[PDB]
Design a protein around this nucleic acid. Structure first.
Ligand SMILES: [Ca+2]
Ligand SMILES: [Zn+2]
Ligand SMILES: [Zn+2]
Lengths: 410, 111, 222
DNA sequence: CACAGTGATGCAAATCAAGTGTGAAGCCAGACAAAAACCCG
DNA sequence: CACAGTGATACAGCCCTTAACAAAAACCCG
DNA sequence: CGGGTTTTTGTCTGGCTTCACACTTGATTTGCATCACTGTGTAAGACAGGCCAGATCCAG
DNA sequence: CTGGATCTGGCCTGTCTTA
DNA sequence: GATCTGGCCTGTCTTA
DNA sequence: CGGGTTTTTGTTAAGGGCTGTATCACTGTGTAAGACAGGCCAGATC
C-alpha cells in the first residue's frame, strides 16, 4: 500500500528545504499456507484485514506524490529488492527448527490516481477510463455489462516499447489508438483491483449529485442557470440537516457515504420531488445499489452473501438498463470510472481472488492517522531525527508480540 | 492488564476514581457569605450550571444556535481556595505566622 | 486589544483614537511619542456613552465624537487598563520585519515601488533568513519567530544585504535601544531583577522616539 | 460490510464478612527398593 | 524574559567485591 | 546385542502443623453491557466548446 | 492592380474526473 | 455646459 | 571511675553494574473584519 499525505507542516532549523507533504509505504501479510499431502491448507489468516494494528510500515519520506523523479529515486531500491525476492526461498529458524518460506507479492492498496501515475497510463479525465480493459468513455456508456480484464504489467511494458520505437511509423492519434493510452514506462508491477473505500466515496458523491439534480427536476428543464444549482444544493443540505441529522461537508468522506446509502434516506428525499415516477426510479436505484454493495464490500462474499453473488449479473444488467432508460439526461455519452469498474469487472475479480474488501486500503489510512499522531507526540522535534523515531515507534506499535500481552483475560 | 498478569490490584478501578473526583470538583464544600450575595442563590451544592442560563429557545423568540457549560463563580472560587490549603498553610508557617490565625486574607485573581 | 475595544465600548483598531489608556489621536501620537498620562477609568466610559446617547449639548456628529473621544457602545465588563505583553512582542516583531523589508528596498531613496518589487524584496529577505538564521517563511507572525528574530546576529544578517553603511549603524542603534527597553515589560519583577533598565527606561524611550522621528521619516511621518 | 475508541449510566455477578468447630494435605524420623539414564559388554 | 515536553547520549552517583587494620559503643570485674 | 554404577522418587510409617471446609444476606465492590459519534480518506489534468485573428480565397 | 467576403488555429475557459 | 459634490469604489493599515 | 572482653562501624585501593540526571535541538498553543484616505464619474447647476 501507498498514499500521499498533505498538510504536513515544516519545522525551523537547519537542513534541506523540505516540502509540505508526506508519502508512506507499508505492507501486510494476509494468509500463510502449507502444502501438506496433495493439496493446500491455510495456517494463519488475518482476522482484521483493514485494522491499523497489522499495517507494518516500511518506508517513510517527505516528498510530493507528483514529484515523479524523487519518487522513483526513493522507491527504486525497494522495487529491485522485491523483484530479486520474487524468485528466491528463505530459510528461517522457528522454535529451533529451520523452516522454508516462499512469497507471492500483491499490491492492491493503491488509489486510482497513484495507479495511473505509476503504471504510466493517462490521467483520470482521459478517454481510456478503465485500468483493466481497453474501452473508451463512449462505449462505457452503451454496453455496461460485457467487458473483460486485459491490462497487465508485461503488456504495459510492451505497449510502451511500441510507443517509443514506433515500428509501423504512424501518426500520433493512430499510435495512441495502437498503444491504448500509455505514455510512460511502468516501474511497479501491480495487479488489477478496485479500492473499496474510494469506490464507495465516488458512488456516494455521484448519488448526491443525482439527488440534487432530481430536486431541480432537470429531466424536463435542460437549461439551468448557476444560482439555481446552488439554491438546489443548499435546499438539499438543509433538508439533510433537518431529517438525517447530517452535516453538510465540502469534501466527501467515508462516514457520510455510509450514512447516506439507506432506503429511508431516499424516503426522506422523496419529500422534495412532486413527481411519482421519479420516486419509484430513485427507490429502485437505491435498492439495486444496496443489493449490489455487499458483493464487493463484504469480507468473504462466498459465505456472507451467496445470494447476492449468484444474482449479481442480473442486478447489474437491470441497473444499467435503469441508468440508460430513466437517467438518459445525464448518462448518455459519459460515465464515471467506478460505475464502469463495478458493473463490468467485479465478478471476475471475486472468481479470481475471492474477496475485495479484504484487499482494500483502509489500514493504510488508519496508519496515516497514527503517523499524524506519532509525528506530533512521539518523535524528537528535529528534521534529522523525527522520521527515524516515528518509523521505530510505529514498527513497535504494529508488533503483534506486544499485542498478545494485552489479551490477558483468555 | 496489570491485574490479570500480576494477580493483584496495584491500581484502583474506575468507580473509585470517579467517587474520588467528587471531592475536587466544585459543589462539595460548605461556605457562606456574611453579606448575602444580591441576586445569587445561597445554595452550596450546584455543579455544572447550564451556560444558556435559561435563555428562551421558543420559535417566536430570537433564535439560539449556541451551547455552553460553566460553574458558579463563587463555588469555583471556594473550590480553588480549598485546593490550595496546604500551600497557604506552609506559607503562613514559613513567614513566622501562627497557623491558627484567621485574619482577613486578600485574594487577587487574573481573568 | 480587539476584545478590549469590543467590551469596553470602543470602535475598531484602525480608528484615530488608538490607545485604550490615553485618549490621544493618531497625529498627536505620531508627534509627541513621549509624554502621555492615563485618564480612562471604567465609570468614565459609562459617562462617555451616556453623553453620546443623550447628547445634552445638541452637537453634530464630529463635535460629539470629539467630545466623547470615540465611544459608541455601552460597556459591560470592567477591565484593567494594562498592556498584553505577548501581542505587544508580536506587533513589534511584525513592524520590525516590515522595516527590514523597507530598508532592503531602499525606500528612502526611491519613494516609488511596485508590488512585484515588494514581492521580490520579501522573498530575498526570507531566503536570506533561511540560509543564515535557520528560519522558514511564515504567513502570520509567530511567537518563537519573534523571540528568535530579535538578535544582534539577525541585524548583522540583514545588514549583509544593505549596500549603505549609515543604515547599518541606524539599525544597530535601533535594535540596541529595543533590547535595552525589552526587559522592563517582560520580567516577573523588574524592580528586583533589572533595575538599571527600569531606571534608564525613559531616556532610552526618548532616544528611540527621536531616532524614529529623524531617520525613519519615510514610514513614521504622521 | 472500517475500527479502535469516548463517556457516563445501568445492571449482573463476586465477595465478604464474623461468627466455628472439625477434615485434610504436607513434614518427619531411615531405608531398601523401583525404575532409569549412563558406562560401555 | 511563556513553558511544558521529547527521545537518545554521556557522566556522576550510588550500590557491589577483597583486605587487613583501626576506631566506637557497651558489660564483667577491679 | 545387555551386566554394573550413579540419579530420580513414591513409598512405608503414625504423630504434628497451617491450612482447608459448611449456611447467612445486605451491602459493597467489580465486571461487563449499552449508546451517540469519530478520523484518517483533502490539487491538477484532460477535454469540449466558443471565440476572434490573421490567413484564404473571390471579385471588377 | 486593389478591396472584400470567410475560414481554420489555437487559446482561454468552463466542466468533469480523480484526489 | 463645464464645475464642483456626493457617493461609490478601492487599496492600505490596524488589530487578530 | 579503667583493663579485659565483646559486638558494630569505617577505611583504602581498584574495578563492574544499575540508576538518576543534565544536555541537545526543537515545537505548539497566541490566525478576519473594519476604519480610512485617495481617486473618480453621474449629475444638479448659475
Ligand atoms: Ca492521501
Ligand atoms: Zn473497464
Ligand atoms: Zn496611549
Amino acid at each position: 500500500s501507498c498514499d500521499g499525505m498533505g498538510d504536513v507542516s515544516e519545522k525551523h532549523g537547519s537542513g534541506p528545504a523540505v516540502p509540505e507533504k508526506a508519502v508512506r509505504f507499508s505492507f501486510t501479510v494476509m494468509r500463510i499456507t502449507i502444502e501438506h499431502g496433495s493439496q493446500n491448507v491455510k495456517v494463519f489468516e488475518e482476522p482484521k484485514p483493514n485494522s491499523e494494528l497489522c499495517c507494518k510500515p516500511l518506508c517513510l519520506m517527505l516528498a510530493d506524490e507528483s514529484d515523479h523523479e524523487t519518487l522513483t529515486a526513493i522507491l527504486s531500491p525497494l522495487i529491485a529488492e522485491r523483484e530479486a525476492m520474487k524468485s528466491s526461498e528463505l530459510t528461517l529458524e522457528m522454535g529451533g527448527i529451520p523452516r522454508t518460506f516462499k512469497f507471492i507479492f500483491r499490491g492492491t492498496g493503491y488509489d486510482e490516481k497513484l495507479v495511473r501515475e505509476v503504471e504510466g497510463l493517462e490521467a483520470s479525465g482521459s478517454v481510456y477510463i478503465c485500468t483493466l480493459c481497453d474501452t473508451t468513455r463512449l462505449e462505457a456508456s452503451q454496453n455496461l455489462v460485457f467487458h473483460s480484464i486485459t491490462r497487465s504489467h508485461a503488456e504495459n511494458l510492451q505497449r510502451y516499447e511500441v510507443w517509443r520505437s514506433n515500428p509501423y511509423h504512424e501518426s500520433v492519434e493512430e499510435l495512441r489508438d495502437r498503444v491504448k493510452g500509455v505514455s510512460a514506462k511502468p516501474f511497479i508491477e501491480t495487479v488489477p483491483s478496485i479500492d473499496a473505500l474510494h469506490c464507495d466515496i465516488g458512488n456516494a458523491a455521484e448519488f448526491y449529485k443525482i439527488f440534487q439534480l432530481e430536486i431541480g427536476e432537470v429531466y424536463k428543464h435542460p437549461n439551468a442557470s448557476k444560482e439555481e444549482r446552488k439554491r438546489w444544493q443548499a435546499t438539499l443540505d438543509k433538508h439533510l440537516r433537518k431529517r438525517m441529522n447530517l452535516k453538510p461537508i465540502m469534501r466527501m468522506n467515508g462516514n457520510f457515504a455510509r450514512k447516506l446509502m439507506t432506503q429511508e434516506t431516499v424516503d426522506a428525499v422523496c419529500e422534495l420531488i412532486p413527481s411519482e415516477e421519479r420516486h419509484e426510479a430513485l427507490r429502485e436505484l437505491m435498492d439495486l445499489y444496496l443489493k449490489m454493495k455487499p458483493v464487493w464490500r463484504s469480507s468473504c462474499p462466498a459465505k456472507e452473501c451467496p445470494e447476492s453473488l449468484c444474482q449479481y449479473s442480473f442486478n447489474s444488467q437491470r441497473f444499467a438498463e435503469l441508468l440508460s432508460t430513466k437517467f438518459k439526461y445525464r448518462y448518455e455519452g459519459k460515465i464515471t470510472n467506478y460505475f464502469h469498474k463495478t458493473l463490468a469487472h467485479v465478478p471476475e475479480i471475486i472468481e479470481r481472488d475471492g474477496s475485495i474488501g479484504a484487499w482494500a486500503s483502509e489500514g493504510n489510512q488508519s496508519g496515516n492517522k497514527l503517523f499524524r499522531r506519532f509525528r506530533k507526540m512521539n518523535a524528537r522535534q528535529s528534521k534529522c531525527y523525527e522520521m527515524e523515531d516515528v518509523l521505530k515507534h510505529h514498527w513497535l506499535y504494529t508488533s503483534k508480540y506486544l499485542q498478545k500481552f494485552m489479551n490477558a483475560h483468555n | 492488564t496489570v491485574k490479570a498478569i500480576t494477580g493483584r490490584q496495584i491500581f484502583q478501578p474506575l468507580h473509585a476514581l470517579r467517587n474520588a473526583e467528587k471531592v475536587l470538583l466544585p459543589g462539595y464544600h460548605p461556605f457562606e457569605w456574611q453579606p448575602p450575595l444580591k441576586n445569587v442563590s445561597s445554595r452550596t451544592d450546584v455543579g455544572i450550571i447550564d451556560g444558556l442560563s435559561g435563555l428562551a429557545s421558543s420559535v417566536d423568540e430570537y433564535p439560539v444556535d449556541t451551547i455552553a457549560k460553566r460553574f458558579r463563580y463563587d463555588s469555583a472560587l471556594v473550590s480553588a481556595l480549598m485546593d490550595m490549603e496546604e500551600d497557604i498553610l506552609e506559607g503562613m508557617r514559613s513567614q513566622d505566622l501562627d497557623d491558627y490565625l484567621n485574619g482577613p486574607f486578600t485574594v487577587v485573581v487574573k481573568e
